[PDB]
Amino acid sequence: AQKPVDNITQIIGGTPVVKLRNVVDDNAADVYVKLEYQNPGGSVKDRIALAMIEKAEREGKIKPGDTIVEPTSGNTGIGLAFVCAAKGYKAVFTMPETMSQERRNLLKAYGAELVLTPGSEAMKGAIKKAKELKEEHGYFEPQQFENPANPEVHELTTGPELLQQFEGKTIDAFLAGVGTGGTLSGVGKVLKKEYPNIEIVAIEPEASPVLSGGEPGPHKLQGLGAGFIPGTLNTEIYDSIIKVGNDTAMEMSRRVAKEEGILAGISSGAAIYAAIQKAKELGKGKTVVTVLPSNGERYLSTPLYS
Amino acid sequence: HHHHHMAQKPVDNITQIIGGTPVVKLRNVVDDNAADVYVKLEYQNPGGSVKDRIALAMIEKAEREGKIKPGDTIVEPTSGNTGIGLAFVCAAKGYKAVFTMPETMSQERRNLLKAYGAELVLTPGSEAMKGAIKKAKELKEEHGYFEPQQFENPANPEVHELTTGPELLQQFEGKTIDAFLAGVGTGGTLSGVGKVLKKEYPNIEIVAIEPEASPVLSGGEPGPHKLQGLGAGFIPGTLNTEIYDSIIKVGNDTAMEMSRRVAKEEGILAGISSGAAIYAAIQKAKELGKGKTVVTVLPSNGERYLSTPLYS
């Protein structure tokens, strides 16, 4: 048990890794999952929310008391609301008025202010309002899809944690779903330098296979498939891409919760499904690692666990 | 190499992550001329609450004793965090779980338990908990299912004696804990932690927290209340009725307002029982003054209660 800390953000990072036991055939490679939902705010986005705020502090772009704006209502918005509450910043989030009441409460619970944009304008309307607050009112915009602090914090923390966790053991493949791409790009850079023969695998939705050259489309892999190539994604870092369908990822999330006792979101089900293909392709004795970005309890209002 | 927090090497299954929960000093909701207030984040258990500890301990002892073996079915009449912890542990260890509850339990909660593969047996909502308890016993007698019994199983207070307590006691080595406060549901946390802290800190004050609207420890009548996880309506067998030196009653609105203050001002988003424990801990922190040290436990996370009035 860790000694007392003065601030909850000091708990961000140092997440555990669990070997999968039942959803992987014993003929395949070992599969390990990093539980990023063990971050105190509930997801991997804790890490970039802290890094984005810390970097802006260092560079004098913000000081505690200042106001932040980001066009998101997902895990990055929760992470920013959490980090801003913990560090004394005011968080403003723009989102379409169609966003759920449960998610609005969670953001408002941390003291964040919500700016609702026209529902038909969807995400594009939220981005426009955020650009207006940044350019015409001086709000600081973290910009999760372009801020280099995003892939860099995974280069400095998530990746080296995996290196410590797999000391003396070789990792044969690392797989991660691509949202902003910061996880895959930053962990990938660190693992490839330490394990030059590792395979880095990007995971993306079958229904929106933008990295594979296909067309953006609606999909149910929440957290994945942004519909474009993020500035935070190093497209050179991955050797291959695995596409996962909506139903396939949901089925595996249900399997992992019931047979491993690990309750994670649909993007984690996609990651574990892809990690299990790679394991079977690599065979016994090899080592496959992936990341579980979020907890299944955040998605009880979705068809994931209905 | 050197820019990351230390991370534990891989474990063979998720139950090995239970325990070892961190402690955070409160900064803003507590005056500096009051005693320091420290909170142990039991919602950092992998299943989301303090109940992971007793779910694992109860199942593991039943194995050690030979009462159950993997593949067997567990039955428990509950819908709260104990059911979640038990569903979580049963999935992790290869047990079947059957829970009874009144049909007025929320749908999101039904999905949570079912996500782990537990069965939900619904009883007439007008028979309330008595109906869920009766159905559990009928199934227990009919099929020989093991019943953990969260309010009677000695493994419940014992695991807090063997893990939660020694954790704090190594988390506070070289410091004096002046008061330890804990809300009483089963009473296992207060009983087990209190026993261990008392042995190390002879002058420590052990405080039970219960709802003002159902103060059964104080000798009042059990009544409806809003402090989820607290106020069982009876004195549980797992509560050591001699461990606590004093009792603090907390009202419904008081705990809710503290939970919202802590979420906005500390960035710590916890359930309503945590707001009650923090309110009582600050009250205790005010009377005994600067320099002293009060410690309490936050049993669950605020995200579990988004559909309740706590955060609407």
CATH code for position A226 = 3.40.50.1100
Phi-psi sector, A3: left (phi>0), alpha (psi -120 to 50), beta:
beta
Residue A128 in domain: yes
Q: Which amino acid is at B263?
A: A
Give the closest residue to B206 by CA, choosing from B157, B230, B250, B241.
B241
Which are the contacts of B108, defined by CB distance < 8 A and separation ≥ 6?
Answer: A300, A301, B307
Q: How many CA atoms lie within 13 A of B297 on its CB side?
A: 36
Residues A156 and A299 in one domain: yes
Residues B219 and B173 in one domain: yes
Q: String of b and e for A178-196 (b: at least 16 CB within 10 Å)?
A: bbbbbbbbbbbbbbbeebe
Last-in-domain residue among A137, A168, A189: A137
Provide the domain limits for residue B82.
68-143
Q: How many residues does chain A have?
A: 306
Residues B197 and B91 in one domain: no
3-state SS class at A175 = strand
Residues B89 and B163 in one domain: no
What secondary structure letter does DSSP report for A171?
A: -
Residue B232 in domain: yes
Resolution given for this structure, in angstroms: 1.9
What secondary structure letter does DSSP report for B126?
A: T
Residues B177 and B301 in one domain: yes
Q: How many CA atoms lie within 13 A of A241 on its CB side?
A: 16
- C-alpha to C-alpha distance for A219 and B94, rounded to whole angstroms: 33
Residue B216 in domain: yes
Which are the contacts of A154, defined by CB distance < 8 A and separation ≥ 6?
Answer: A47, A48, A182, A183, A185, A186, A187, A190
Is B286 among the catalytic positions? no
Separate counts of helices (H) and strands (E) for chain A: 9, 9
| Burial of residue A164 (number of CB atoms within 10 Å: 0-12, 13-18, 19+) | middle
Residue B2 in domain: no
Residues A267 and A298 in one domain: yes
Q: Which residues of A touch B13 (CB under 8 A)?
A: 18-19, 21, 260-261
The residue in chain A having the minimum alpha-carbon distance to the alpha carbon of residue B256 is A109
Q: Given an 8 Å threshold on Cβ–Cβ distance, is B24 in contact with A11?
A: yes
The CA-CA-CA angle for residues A25, A30, A36, to 5°, reads 115
Residue B53 in domain: no
What phi and psi values does residue A215 have, to the nearest 5 degrees? -95, 145
| Burial of residue A2 (number of CB atoms within 10 Å: 0-12, 13-18, 19+) | middle
Max CA pair span of chain A = 59
Residues A88 and A176 in one domain: no
Chain B interface mutation, best of A75, A103, A105, highest count of B Cβ atoms under 10 Å: A105
Last-in-domain residue among B116, B143, B170: B143
- C-alpha to C-alpha distance for B95 and B107, rounded to whole angstroms: 23
Q: Which spans in A234-265 are helix H? A: 246-260
| Burial of residue A43 (number of CB atoms within 10 Å: 0-12, 13-18, 19+) | buried
Q: List all residues of chain A from 176 to 215 with a beta carbon under 8 Å from chain B.
A: none
Which are the contacts of B43, defined by CB distance < 8 A and separation ≥ 6?
Answer: B49, B50, B270, B271, B274, B298, B299, B300, B301
| Burial of residue B1 (number of CB atoms within 10 Å: 0-12, 13-18, 19+) | exposed
A4 and B CB contact within 8 Å = yes
Q: Which spans in chain B are helix H? A: 51-64, 81-93, 107-115, 128-143, 155-159, 165-171, 188-200, 252-266, 272-288
Residues A111 and A37 in one domain: no
A119 and B CB contact within 8 Å = no
Residues B210 and B104 in one domain: no
Residue B57 in domain: no
Give the closest residue to A73 by CA, choosing from A106, A120, A119, A121.
A106
Residues B164 and B243 in one domain: yes
Residue B169 in domain: yes
Residues B175 and B276 in one domain: yes
Total tally of structural domains belonging to chain A: 2
- C-alpha to C-alpha distance for B121 and B74, rounded to whole angstroms: 13
Q: Which residues of A touch B48 (CB under 8 A)?
A: 295, 297
Residue B277 in domain: yes
Last-in-domain residue among B143, B176, B196: B143
To the nearest whole angstrom, how far is the Cα of A293 from the nearest Cα of chain B?
14
Residues A94 and A205 in one domain: no
